[PDB]
Swiss-Prot record:
Positions bearing the site annotation: Raises pKa of active site His: 144
Ranges for region GART domain: 3-200
Quaternary structure, from the entry: Homodimer.
Family recorded in the similarity comment: In the N-terminal section; belongs to the GARS family. In the central section; belongs to the AIR synthase family.
Sites where the protein binds (6R)-10-formyltetrahydrofolate: 64, 89-92, 106, 140-144
Protein name: Trifunctional purine biosynthetic protein adenosine-3
UniProt function note: Trifunctional enzyme that catalyzes three distinct reactions as part of the 'de novo' inosine monophosphate biosynthetic pathway.
Naturally occurring in which organism (per UniProt): Homo sapiens
Residues at which N(1)-(5-phospho-beta-D-ribosyl)glycinamide binds: 11-13, 170-173
Organism domain of life: Eukaryota
Amino acid sequence: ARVAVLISGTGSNLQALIDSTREPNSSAQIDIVISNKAAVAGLDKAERAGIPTRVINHKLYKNRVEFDSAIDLVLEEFSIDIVCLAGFMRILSGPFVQKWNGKMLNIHPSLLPSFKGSNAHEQALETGVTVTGCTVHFVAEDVDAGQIILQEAVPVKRGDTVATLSERVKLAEHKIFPAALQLVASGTVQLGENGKICWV
Ligand SMILES: Nc1nc2[nH]c(CCCc3csc(C(=O)N[C@@H](CCC(=O)O)C(=O)O)c3)cc2c(=O)[nH]1
Ligand SMILES: NCC(=O)N[C@@H]1O[C@H](COP(=O)([O-])[O-])[C@@H](O)[C@H]1O
């Protein structure tokens, strides 16, 4: 299966996916990396791995639909089967999500359904949980609400900050995102017609 990875920043999840998808038994190959932001470290990681990159600046578009259409054009150019959102921070439009239904995965740094949104660690710390984690899910129109594929719990230590908690949770993200991508790319897991996850 042919994979696009979308990023907005550092690209540690991208690197873990590069490493995993290059193992001999990988059912996935990363054929394009798309960033909506120029000059981020994830682009450097892609270039070092010899993977083509595109920068599609969302600020140059009138609305989400036009921006998403520009992404979609590149996905078609590279005959992409599966899209991974890996630190990509844009909310996607309904029609784009529907087109890629069952074919687009996101990593989120909480145990969904807790702490949806852009600042999950801030929320986890404010709430005072002692267990947080990360989630890979299929992308549905409602943000951070699509069907869950894998999760991993991560402890919160007393005195944690966003810096220390996010570091600990990323170790788990780098485990479950590659595992989830392999499950979907191999056809082991799919989004069922009834809208629920199906393990073949
Ligand atoms: N339809 C849909 N889109 C999605 N995008 C992402 C991946 C991102 C999930 C995400 C969580 S909060 C947020 C957000 O507020 N984005 C802002 C930009 C904020 C910033 O620049 O930091 C926006 O897009 O206006 C983005 C996941 C996902 C999803 O499940 N459904
Ligand atoms: N709303 C999505 C979200 O918060 N994503 C989170 O952004 C970070 C990106 O790190 P990376 O660029 O090093 O992969 C990761 O922690 C990811 O789960």
